[PDB]
Amino acid sequence: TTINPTNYTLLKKQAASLIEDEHHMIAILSNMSALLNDNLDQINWVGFYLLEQNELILGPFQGHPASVHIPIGKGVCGTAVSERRTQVVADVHQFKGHIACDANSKSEIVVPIFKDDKIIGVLDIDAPITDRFDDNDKEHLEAIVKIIEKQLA
Amino acid sequence: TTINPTNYTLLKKQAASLIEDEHHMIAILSNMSALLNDNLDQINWVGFYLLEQNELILGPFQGHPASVHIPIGKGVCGTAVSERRTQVVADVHQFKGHIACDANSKSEIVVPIFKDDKIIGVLDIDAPITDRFDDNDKEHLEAIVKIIEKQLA
Numbered sequence A, B: 001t002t003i004n005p006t007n008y009t010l011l012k013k014q015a016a017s018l019i020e021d022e023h024h025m026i027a028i029l030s031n032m033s034a035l036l037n038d039n040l041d042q043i044n045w046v047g048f049y050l051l052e053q054n055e056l057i058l059g060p061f062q063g064h065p066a067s068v069h070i071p072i073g074k075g076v077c078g079t080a081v082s083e084r085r086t087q088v089v090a091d092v093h094q095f096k097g098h099i100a101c102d103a104n105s106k107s108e109i110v111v112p113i114f115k116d117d118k119i120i121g122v123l124d125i126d127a128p129i130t131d132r133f134d135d136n137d138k139e140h141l142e143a144i145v146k147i148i149e150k151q152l153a
């Protein structure tokens, strides 16, 4: 029950190695969601939403089925895009309503992905506990999106 | 050693219902790999590969990271496209070579996905035991593919 630490150092190394020479977005996203899922303890969902036709639409991910459409400025994902900055949410509950979405997502973090400064999607990770993600997770997770951005650039 | 029965009757209802009113391929493929994963015991990988520029390129899936490219006519997946027919392998080992790919994959099932007479990809499922998929599994799984093909149609 004790969150066993994640060696982000190795993670960024495993990530870069993993998508080297690949430029196809979906493949990269798919393998990355799996990679993150294999090296992040105490979480229940890790994936990507893509910005298409002025909204977020579900991309590759590891976990149970999820909502396909997320309007901009709505939710943690929609908020990361409307403000184009990472969203680290310690308590997903007091964030917007407390409806049927109060499953195993107590805390959460969303990192926007950019290509030539424009938002092309976001990285979304859920956790069954509160305060799962902090400044440190933020830094490192943003380094990962950067490794991803390099292959899509 | 045993395989817990899978309620394909229900699964097909949740499937059709899960992707009702959706037409975005990646969203559908992603949520579908999740559904399959939550409803199939004794398997270690479930996902899709997309037919692009004369080859299969990794798509949404649930499991550990997988190889990105698979040329047509190659492996279990490439053969399903080159022959455009479902491929069921009772013992993946005796198939092709027994290299570093003999991991948790003992048996496998691949089902080509068609759109207006052409193949757009394949559903692929690995199992940690041999003979995981019998004629019954295949038919209902092909049924699942049909539900997906209806949405991509």
Ligand SMILES: C[S@](=O)CC[C@H](N)C(=O)O
Binding pocket: A045, A066, A067, A070, A074, A075, A076, A077, A078, A105, A108, A124, A125, A126
């Ligand atoms: C975007 S909304 O604020 C949360 C989405 C959810 N974490 C998911 O797994 O899709």
Ligand SMILES: C[S@](=O)CC[C@H](N)C(=O)O
Binding pocket: B045, B066, B067, B070, B074, B075, B076, B077, B078, B108, B124, B125, B126
């Ligand atoms: C052609 S190959 O042997 C297909 C892909 C492999 N089952 C996988 O699980 O990714």
